[PDB]
């Protein structure tokens, strides 16, 4: 069935753009990552890795 | 108090028809049933009655 996308219609049938993100969570090599900066590893010292 | 059921009014106060059905659930003889066809019973056999 088609839609009556009339610009004069009220909020009763005002269309919106919609995006669905299905994040993939599993134990696998990671490709996409957030915006952080790497540092230097520290050996033989208690660190919050 | 009455209502301003104006057809030119927006979706703010557009009345709807509502039908409420209250199913009755108890261990009592059943009168209303779904659209399924009965079968013939089997004796002395493991059967999902």
Short mmCIF file of N, CA and C in Angstrom, two decimals:
data_model
loop_
_atom_site.label_atom_id
_atom_site.label_comp_id
_atom_site.label_asym_id
_atom_site.label_seq_id
_atom_site.Cartn_x
_atom_site.Cartn_y
_atom_site.Cartn_z
N UNK A 1 0.84 -1.19 0.00
CA UNK A 1 0.00 0.00 0.00
C UNK A 1 0.88 1.24 0.00
N UNK A 2 0.51 2.22 -0.83
CA UNK A 2 1.25 3.47 -0.91
C UNK A 2 0.97 4.33 0.32
N UNK A 3 1.56 5.52 0.34
CA UNK A 3 1.39 6.45 1.44
C UNK A 3 0.94 7.81 0.92
N UNK A 4 0.08 8.46 1.69
CA UNK A 4 -0.31 9.82 1.40
C UNK A 4 0.62 10.81 2.07
N UNK A 5 1.86 10.89 1.59
CA UNK A 5 2.85 11.78 2.20
C UNK A 5 2.56 13.23 1.84
N UNK A 6 1.43 13.75 2.30
CA UNK A 6 1.09 15.14 2.06
C UNK A 6 1.85 16.03 3.03
N UNK A 7 2.57 17.04 2.54
CA UNK A 7 3.28 17.95 3.46
C UNK A 7 2.34 18.72 4.37
N UNK A 8 1.07 18.84 4.01
CA UNK A 8 0.10 19.55 4.85
C UNK A 8 -0.42 18.70 6.00
N UNK A 9 -0.22 17.38 5.96
CA UNK A 9 -0.70 16.52 7.03
C UNK A 9 0.03 16.82 8.33
N UNK A 10 -0.67 16.59 9.44
CA UNK A 10 -0.11 16.81 10.76
C UNK A 10 0.80 15.68 11.20
N UNK A 11 1.12 15.70 12.49
CA UNK A 11 2.05 14.75 13.08
C UNK A 11 1.44 13.35 13.13
N UNK A 12 0.20 13.22 12.68
CA UNK A 12 -0.43 11.91 12.66
C UNK A 12 0.28 10.92 11.75
N UNK A 13 0.79 11.40 10.62
CA UNK A 13 1.51 10.55 9.67
C UNK A 13 2.72 11.28 9.10
N UNK A 14 3.50 11.92 9.97
CA UNK A 14 4.72 12.60 9.54
C UNK A 14 5.85 11.59 9.47
N UNK A 15 6.39 11.28 8.29
CA UNK A 15 7.45 10.28 8.20
C UNK A 15 8.77 10.79 8.75
N UNK A 16 9.54 9.86 9.33
CA UNK A 16 10.88 10.12 9.83
C UNK A 16 11.87 9.19 9.14
N UNK A 17 13.11 9.67 9.02
CA UNK A 17 14.21 8.79 8.66
C UNK A 17 14.61 7.97 9.88
N UNK A 18 14.95 6.70 9.65
CA UNK A 18 15.26 5.75 10.70
C UNK A 18 16.49 4.94 10.30
N UNK A 19 17.42 4.79 11.24
CA UNK A 19 18.62 3.97 11.06
C UNK A 19 18.68 2.98 12.22
N UNK A 20 18.97 1.73 11.91
CA UNK A 20 19.11 0.67 12.90
C UNK A 20 20.53 0.15 12.83
N UNK A 21 21.24 0.19 13.96
CA UNK A 21 22.59 -0.34 14.06
C UNK A 21 22.54 -1.60 14.90
N UNK A 22 22.99 -2.71 14.32
CA UNK A 22 23.07 -3.99 15.01
C UNK A 22 24.54 -4.28 15.28
N UNK A 23 25.00 -3.91 16.47
CA UNK A 23 26.40 -4.07 16.80
C UNK A 23 26.74 -5.55 16.93
N UNK A 24 27.88 -5.95 16.38
CA UNK A 24 28.31 -7.34 16.38
C UNK A 24 29.28 -7.55 17.54
N UNK A 25 28.84 -8.31 18.54
CA UNK A 25 29.61 -8.57 19.75
C UNK A 25 29.96 -10.05 19.81
N UNK A 26 31.23 -10.37 19.60
CA UNK A 26 31.71 -11.74 19.74
C UNK A 26 33.21 -11.70 19.96
N UNK A 27 33.75 -12.83 20.42
CA UNK A 27 35.19 -12.98 20.60
C UNK A 27 35.81 -13.22 19.23
N UNK A 28 36.26 -12.13 18.61
CA UNK A 28 36.83 -12.15 17.28
C UNK A 28 37.74 -10.94 17.14
N UNK A 29 38.65 -10.94 16.16
CA UNK A 29 39.49 -9.76 15.96
C UNK A 29 38.65 -8.51 15.75
N UNK A 30 39.08 -7.41 16.36
CA UNK A 30 38.33 -6.17 16.36
C UNK A 30 38.81 -5.26 15.25
N UNK A 31 37.86 -4.72 14.49
CA UNK A 31 38.17 -3.85 13.36
C UNK A 31 37.79 -2.40 13.62
N UNK A 32 36.53 -2.13 13.95
CA UNK A 32 36.10 -0.78 14.27
C UNK A 32 36.37 -0.52 15.75
N UNK A 33 36.82 0.70 16.06
CA UNK A 33 37.18 1.05 17.42
C UNK A 33 36.87 2.52 17.66
N UNK A 34 36.82 2.89 18.93
CA UNK A 34 36.55 4.25 19.32
C UNK A 34 37.77 5.13 19.18
N UNK A 35 37.58 6.43 19.41
CA UNK A 35 38.65 7.43 19.23
C UNK A 35 39.54 7.62 20.46
N UNK A 36 40.50 6.71 20.64
CA UNK A 36 41.44 6.79 21.74
C UNK A 36 42.86 6.67 21.19
N UNK A 37 43.83 7.01 22.04
CA UNK A 37 45.24 7.02 21.66
C UNK A 37 45.99 5.93 22.41
N UNK A 38 46.82 5.19 21.68
CA UNK A 38 47.61 4.12 22.28
C UNK A 38 48.73 4.70 23.13
N UNK A 39 49.30 3.85 23.98
CA UNK A 39 50.43 4.23 24.82
C UNK A 39 51.49 3.14 24.78
N UNK A 40 52.48 3.23 25.66
CA UNK A 40 53.56 2.26 25.72
C UNK A 40 53.28 1.24 26.81
N UNK A 41 53.43 -0.04 26.48
CA UNK A 41 53.21 -1.10 27.45
C UNK A 41 54.27 -1.04 28.55
N UNK A 42 53.90 -1.49 29.74
CA UNK A 42 54.78 -1.50 30.90
C UNK A 42 54.88 -2.93 31.41
N UNK A 43 56.11 -3.39 31.60
CA UNK A 43 56.37 -4.76 32.01
C UNK A 43 56.80 -4.81 33.47
N UNK A 44 56.45 -5.92 34.13
CA UNK A 44 56.87 -6.20 35.50
C UNK A 44 56.40 -5.12 36.48
N UNK A 45 55.26 -4.51 36.20
CA UNK A 45 54.68 -3.50 37.08
C UNK A 45 53.16 -3.58 37.00
N UNK A 46 52.51 -3.46 38.16
CA UNK A 46 51.06 -3.54 38.22
C UNK A 46 50.44 -2.35 37.51
N UNK A 47 49.77 -2.60 36.39
CA UNK A 47 49.19 -1.56 35.55
C UNK A 47 47.75 -1.92 35.24
N UNK A 48 46.93 -0.90 34.96
CA UNK A 48 45.53 -1.09 34.61
C UNK A 48 45.41 -1.22 33.10
N UNK A 49 45.77 -2.40 32.59
CA UNK A 49 45.80 -2.61 31.15
C UNK A 49 44.39 -2.60 30.57
N UNK B 1 -19.46 15.72 31.47
CA UNK B 1 -19.15 16.77 30.51
C UNK B 1 -19.08 16.18 29.11
N UNK B 2 -19.35 17.02 28.11
CA UNK B 2 -19.42 16.56 26.73
C UNK B 2 -18.05 16.67 26.06
N UNK B 3 -18.00 16.44 24.75
CA UNK B 3 -16.76 16.44 23.99
C UNK B 3 -16.90 17.31 22.75
N UNK B 4 -15.79 17.92 22.34
CA UNK B 4 -15.74 18.67 21.11
C UNK B 4 -15.31 17.82 19.93
N UNK B 5 -16.16 16.89 19.51
CA UNK B 5 -15.81 15.93 18.46
C UNK B 5 -15.94 16.59 17.09
N UNK B 6 -15.02 17.52 16.83
CA UNK B 6 -15.00 18.22 15.55
C UNK B 6 -14.18 17.44 14.53
N UNK B 7 -14.75 17.10 13.37
CA UNK B 7 -13.96 16.39 12.35
C UNK B 7 -12.75 17.17 11.87
N UNK B 8 -12.81 18.50 11.86
CA UNK B 8 -11.67 19.31 11.44
C UNK B 8 -10.57 19.37 12.49
N UNK B 9 -10.82 18.90 13.70
CA UNK B 9 -9.80 18.89 14.74
C UNK B 9 -8.69 17.90 14.38
N UNK B 10 -7.51 18.14 14.94
CA UNK B 10 -6.36 17.29 14.69
C UNK B 10 -6.44 15.99 15.46
N UNK B 11 -5.34 15.25 15.42
CA UNK B 11 -5.25 13.93 16.03
C UNK B 11 -5.23 14.03 17.55
N UNK B 12 -5.28 15.26 18.07
CA UNK B 12 -5.24 15.45 19.51
C UNK B 12 -6.43 14.84 20.22
N UNK B 13 -7.62 14.94 19.63
CA UNK B 13 -8.84 14.42 20.24
C UNK B 13 -9.71 13.72 19.20
N UNK B 14 -9.10 12.86 18.40
CA UNK B 14 -9.85 12.05 17.45
C UNK B 14 -10.32 10.78 18.15
N UNK B 15 -11.62 10.60 18.37
CA UNK B 15 -12.08 9.42 19.10
C UNK B 15 -11.87 8.13 18.31
N UNK B 16 -11.59 7.06 19.05
CA UNK B 16 -11.41 5.73 18.50
C UNK B 16 -12.46 4.78 19.06
N UNK B 17 -12.85 3.82 18.22
CA UNK B 17 -13.61 2.67 18.68
C UNK B 17 -12.69 1.68 19.36
N UNK B 18 -13.11 1.19 20.52
CA UNK B 18 -12.34 0.26 21.33
C UNK B 18 -13.24 -0.91 21.70
N UNK B 19 -12.76 -2.12 21.45
CA UNK B 19 -13.43 -3.36 21.82
C UNK B 19 -12.56 -4.10 22.82
N UNK B 20 -13.11 -4.37 23.99
CA UNK B 20 -12.40 -5.05 25.07
C UNK B 20 -13.02 -6.43 25.23
N UNK B 21 -12.18 -7.46 25.12
CA UNK B 21 -12.60 -8.84 25.35
C UNK B 21 -11.87 -9.36 26.58
N UNK B 22 -12.62 -9.94 27.50
CA UNK B 22 -12.08 -10.51 28.73
C UNK B 22 -12.25 -12.03 28.65
N UNK B 23 -11.17 -12.71 28.28
CA UNK B 23 -11.21 -14.16 28.20
C UNK B 23 -11.38 -14.76 29.59
N UNK B 24 -12.18 -15.83 29.67
CA UNK B 24 -12.46 -16.51 30.92
C UNK B 24 -11.61 -17.77 30.99
N UNK B 25 -10.72 -17.84 31.98
CA UNK B 25 -9.80 -18.96 32.15
C UNK B 25 -10.08 -19.63 33.49
N UNK B 26 -10.62 -20.84 33.45
CA UNK B 26 -10.84 -21.65 34.64
C UNK B 26 -11.12 -23.07 34.19
N UNK B 27 -11.07 -24.00 35.15
CA UNK B 27 -11.34 -25.41 34.87
C UNK B 27 -12.85 -25.62 34.87
N UNK B 28 -13.49 -25.21 33.78
CA UNK B 28 -14.93 -25.31 33.63
C UNK B 28 -15.22 -25.83 32.23
N UNK B 29 -16.40 -26.41 32.01
CA UNK B 29 -16.74 -26.88 30.66
C UNK B 29 -16.64 -25.75 29.64
N UNK B 30 -16.06 -26.07 28.49
CA UNK B 30 -15.76 -25.08 27.47
C UNK B 30 -16.84 -25.07 26.40
N UNK B 31 -17.24 -23.87 25.99
CA UNK B 31 -18.24 -23.68 24.96
C UNK B 31 -17.66 -23.11 23.67
N UNK B 32 -16.86 -22.06 23.77
CA UNK B 32 -16.22 -21.46 22.61
C UNK B 32 -14.87 -22.13 22.39
N UNK B 33 -14.56 -22.45 21.14
CA UNK B 33 -13.33 -23.15 20.80
C UNK B 33 -12.82 -22.66 19.45
N UNK B 34 -11.55 -22.94 19.19
CA UNK B 34 -10.89 -22.47 18.00
C UNK B 34 -11.27 -23.28 16.78
N UNK B 35 -10.75 -22.85 15.62
CA UNK B 35 -11.08 -23.50 14.34
C UNK B 35 -10.15 -24.66 14.01
N UNK B 36 -10.32 -25.76 14.75
CA UNK B 36 -9.53 -26.96 14.54
C UNK B 36 -10.46 -28.16 14.41
N UNK B 37 -9.97 -29.19 13.72
CA UNK B 37 -10.74 -30.39 13.43
C UNK B 37 -10.29 -31.52 14.34
N UNK B 38 -11.26 -32.23 14.91
CA UNK B 38 -10.97 -33.30 15.86
C UNK B 38 -10.44 -34.54 15.14
N UNK B 39 -9.91 -35.47 15.93
CA UNK B 39 -9.38 -36.72 15.41
C UNK B 39 -9.97 -37.90 16.16
N UNK B 40 -9.45 -39.10 15.92
CA UNK B 40 -9.95 -40.31 16.56
C UNK B 40 -8.93 -40.82 17.57
N UNK B 41 -9.42 -41.23 18.74
CA UNK B 41 -8.55 -41.61 19.84
C UNK B 41 -7.85 -42.94 19.56
N UNK B 42 -6.73 -43.14 20.24
CA UNK B 42 -5.93 -44.36 20.13
C UNK B 42 -5.64 -44.87 21.53
N UNK B 43 -5.78 -46.17 21.73
CA UNK B 43 -5.58 -46.80 23.03
C UNK B 43 -4.27 -47.56 23.08
N UNK B 44 -3.72 -47.67 24.29
CA UNK B 44 -2.55 -48.51 24.57
C UNK B 44 -1.32 -48.08 23.77
N UNK B 45 -1.21 -46.79 23.47
CA UNK B 45 -0.09 -46.27 22.70
C UNK B 45 0.32 -44.92 23.26
N UNK B 46 1.63 -44.68 23.31
CA UNK B 46 2.15 -43.39 23.76
C UNK B 46 1.85 -42.34 22.70
N UNK B 47 0.85 -41.50 22.96
CA UNK B 47 0.36 -40.53 21.99
C UNK B 47 0.13 -39.20 22.70
N UNK B 48 0.55 -38.11 22.05
CA UNK B 48 0.40 -36.76 22.59
C UNK B 48 -1.06 -36.33 22.44
N UNK B 49 -1.87 -36.70 23.42
CA UNK B 49 -3.28 -36.34 23.41
C UNK B 49 -3.46 -34.84 23.62
#
